[model samples]
Target: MLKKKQLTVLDLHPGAGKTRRVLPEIVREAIKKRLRTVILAPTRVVAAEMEEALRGLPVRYMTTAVNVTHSGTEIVDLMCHATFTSRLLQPIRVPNYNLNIMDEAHFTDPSSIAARGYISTRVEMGEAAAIFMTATPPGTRDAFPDSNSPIMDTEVEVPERAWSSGFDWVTDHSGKTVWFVPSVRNGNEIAACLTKAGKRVIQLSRKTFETEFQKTKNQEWDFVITTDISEMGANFKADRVIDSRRCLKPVILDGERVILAGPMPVTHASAAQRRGRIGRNPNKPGDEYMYGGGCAETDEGHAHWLEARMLLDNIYLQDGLIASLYRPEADKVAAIEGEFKLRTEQRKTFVELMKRGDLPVWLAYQVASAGITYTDRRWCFDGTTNNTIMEDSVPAEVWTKYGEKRVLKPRWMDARVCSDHAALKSFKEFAAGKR
Candidate 1:
């Protein structure tokens, strides 16, 4: 067996097939070295799937060694119950493991709790071998060596294919139309057109539609135009999955039946996820069609252009310029900014203060208001242009019951009026400060 120093690096690929391909090689090396490895998945489903795949290999169910961590207790039980001694939740404490495999390597950003936990855990445990199994690593090669980042060695490059070719495969086998609906209005218009053509158009809105749609297994609708929400999670076998511009995001799949459509540009991650959907049914030729509305440029292209100018020119001072304009309101700003943090103007101030090491614990609550609700990840900012931005972290229902205005207007007015008052110390401080 090689000494711990001898195993400084190990190579692996990341994707759906990443586990199946790389797990065996890692397992072989682990068995030869008698080294233990801990695997972390973002979700229990992925962890379970990974465990099942590796179970048939030489790797044994060693409770003292192997561990699984995620939300599901049953998955934890799967390892613990089977091994009769597995480390369940706090898998990082088991110091003797030789390797750590993180599924989503890109999530190792500083802001993530999991990333912080893993880094601290590994540092405390000493120099263990790490096999990051993800297609997206943190940054480019230039940022690698100084950061002790892993090197990418292996290459299983795929050849380029046409999108129309992929769509033809799905439709030829299933006899479906490859109609393109670019917007929400287009979707409705298409539904109306199909309805006028004597096709019964059924819209799937809620989760309950899953049960209702599944009942018609034996029957075939002439055309099924549905929203992305209805398409996800449910097992409704369709002829083709169309990509529309109005769709929130492209659906990731692993079967050959999907046909990517619409003018919407695909991100690298989305492209990888979408391509995986094809070829699940091996008998059919897996196909994908990359359609563009004469706009061949990727979305990242525009961002790159802006970033380049931002680096080279004075236009980059736009944020600072906007911040300067808000200096006059310093006297009217409240101390603990409340939900006002949701306003873009307030959010900029919060970020600026944090960058300057001026953000206090009380300010954290203010910044929290700028974020989305606990139930949704969307930002709390109202979709309107206002010179004086308003925000709240408090849910609307709470204020309504108390007979207070559900919006931030009344609170903002009061904050402005009491700016000269000393009784509200926190509010006065905020008003006096730059934020």
Candidate 2:
């Protein structure tokens, strides 16, 4: 008699029907095995869509066995809700047959509040199989156990593929010629200049998410200079996306031109986040362009001027080096807790190699051997922690480079400052090189 092998080897090509296709396989697998599984998706829309799609499957029209979770909604199906609550509130009595799937699993990190909650919720309930699914997982692949062969592992392994890939969709066709400006100042100035040139111009800042949304409800802007927030999820497609926040190098993807202007170093984390902006449209592939304003030139000799360069060069190397250099130990744990706010319980199972003292050879050569001194003194400032940036007392160039985007802006400034509004204005002028 022929018998079914414990693990069936089936050759199947999974299409990119993100919700409709993938969700069913996960559900069917769980049901067949009678295993408890958890599905975690990055966004609410994805989770809701998956839940709706599952309704057509063999599960049920309104069976309590299915569940959905996010900030806005909770799983209400009888079997699913009961299983979730029973596992959480009263664990011992709950049955142990289910599945857990985490969509956009790249976001699973201790730093993310949502990630921490998601992990704690399922792990506490004694979840059996934990499957994480995302088109692009983050750098922390080592955190998962036995992730060598993920379910969707083969989807991204195409040869002759450039790192620059994805959906490029444009809508509301017009010959307006939207120019992405380099540098926020240049963008703002260019917008003003274009307005005077008899073209309509609009400036959108990072702080104006709702404002930009409201203005572009019907996609009615001839020229808009918006921030990085506009790069994701917004359905409005312009004749062109002119990125003018050029402190860093521009990032072009799937034909979408992203202007990287701003002083913040184009670290690895930043580049990956920026690449997600392209290829959002299923119908069309967009065009991408990069403009360098001599301020940060990107010749073959100086490719580091590009954000992608930094990601490939510094980010990967630094992460590997840092992870290797620091082993988790009691002393390191104590120091980290005292200095960085890590908890004691979080410090467990630490081992690393080092022949010398507290500093590594590379760090010692770069920092300690250099003629730099670490000081805890307060000079020209009232307290040790008091920031000179907020005082409007520091130089404008410095203020423009750091304080404006960070802690010192009036909107995010310390309430203790007596003249926050006036100082913020002063800081802004300096940041724009106006002062």
Candidate 3:
């Protein structure tokens, strides 16, 4: 496999020892050839979890998350996708790893900043090899159509599944139950109800989950009433799940957040994934059931449907990098150069507006970080990515470089004052290198 390497889609089934058995062999081969090897996890908690599974090898995992338990190995490097992407897109040099293995690869969107950065790392390696390992294949591989790199497609066959990897949504409130609530306020109310109902409960968000949970090791959790933070790779083998999602998605009407509640489909790839979080502990009695509704007619169809999805921001950011660094492979990924051009023109207009006191600096940051949605009357900020790209009211400048499409070059400025409307207006000019 190493002799003539290309992009290899290692579509293996879950609980197939992909990490415990198969990953070690792949890394050994890559190391024999003297190639830099890397294993990427979806989050810091998952990356730390790999320490026990990896078959006694020298592995060094680099992370920015505070107080992570480190093995401090030297040969093969491990890190979260967040760190890996951050390094790839940073202005400084990111170490080139020719052979890369992405664990839980289904979590990464093909057109996201992380996806583009991953591809960029491969491009940097000059005929680099990648192993996209996942039980649920996303189906779409956006490896540019005309790139010089080769491709390998392989699916490992697994025997009968030993343990159940799904959940049921009946009214079961047994041991180690987790209540997935809608919002923070709702979580608190539910926690109050559960506490009064004689059930031990704890509520935490993504921030507290990472910072406090890791430090304290609070494992005596009977019922963890949380938001969407419990969706992914932290091993909380709960026996019961209460998914009370009210379908209260946020929308902006007049440049401000307005919450609306409605009915949403019960069946989705995300729903299936969330349900799979239960029924994980084999030692637990009976099948773990989630008290919820609506997920799947069949898992196979959802997997197929997941592959066809794409985001414009993912494409624009990736194609921007493709247009910048790997210009030779431009036609390989970029479908619409005209769309890129239009975005560029729009950014210029935004800059002009900011300079002329027509738009706020905070608005520019919103446009750059969270892509602004433009209706006939209102400019709306999509609040999907909550990653701290912008500070509170101090207001980051509209990073023209990131907006232009290449990786971001974060220009930290201390010269700016606070975040009032007028200060933000003046700071925007200074932040943008305006006089």
The candidate that achieves the highest TM-score relative to the unseen native structure: 3
What TM value does model 1 have? 0.38
> What tens-digit string does per-residue lDDT give for candidate 1 at 238-337?
3333433232221112211111234354333333322222222334442332222222223222222221121111111123321111111122222221
To one decimal, what is the Cα RMSD in angstroms of model 1 from the true structure? 16.7
Residue by residue across 43-67, what tens digits does model 3's lDDT show?
6676666766663566676765424
Window of ten residues with lowest summed lDDT in model 1: 81-90
lDDT, residue 198, candidate 3: 65
**Which candidate model has the greater TM-score, 1 or 3?**
3
| Candidate number of the best lDDT | 3
lDDT score for candidate 3 against the true structure:
0.45
Model 2 clash number: 39
TM for every model, in the order presented, reads: 0.38, 0.38, 0.56
- Write candidate 2's Cα lDDT for 297-378 as tens digits: 2211211112111111111111232111111111111111112111122111000000111111122122222232222111
- Name the TM-score of candidate 3: 0.56
Superposition error at 77 for model 2 (Å): 11
lDDT of each: 0.33, 0.31, 0.45
